[PDB]
Amino acid sequence: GKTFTRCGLVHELRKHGFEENLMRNWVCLVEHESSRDTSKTNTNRNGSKDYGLFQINDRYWCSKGASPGKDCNVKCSDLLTDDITKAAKCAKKIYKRHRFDAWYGWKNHCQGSLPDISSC
């Protein structure tokens, strides 16, 4: 697991199939959820835990076990590896029903201001 910079994240998502017109929303969401860190985790009041760059939950999208086998066919520990793609492809499969509303940071802080990406 590693941390990314905004220019690195903008590029990593552009390579992983994220739209340049949505990139501002995506990086500003990710900067509140994981702070651009693949190693980040958070526990919930419901007893489940969140993993990887999009803080994906072991009961809803990824799987906590030794093998993948959940709604996005991906394992919580694979989201902690040095390429975000395991979390990013699952984030696209969520965006098919909830483009940004599946993440609390976007509706808590990205409604006020977004960062610039025109230097990336």
Swiss-Prot record:
Catalysed reactions, as listed in the record: Hydrolysis of (1->4)-beta-linkages between N-acetylmuramic acid and N-acetyl-D-glucosamine residues in a peptidoglycan and between N-acetyl-D-glucosamine residues in chitodextrins
Keyword Membrane: no
UniProt cross-references to Pfam families, sorted A to Z: Lys
Active site: E33, D50
Gene3D superfamilies in the cross-refs: 1.10.530.10
E.C. number: 3.2.1.17
Residue ranges of domain C-type lysozyme in the record: 2-120
GO biological-process terms attached to the record: defense response to bacterium; killing of cells of another organism
CDD domains: LYZ
Keyword Transport: no
Keyword set, alphabetical order: Antibiotic, Antimicrobial, Bacteriolytic enzyme, Disulfide bond, Glycosidase, Hydrolase, Signal
GO molecular function: lysozyme activity
Family designation: Belongs to the glycosyl hydrolase 22 family.
Name under which the protein is recorded: Lysozyme
Species of the source: Bombyx mori (Silk moth)
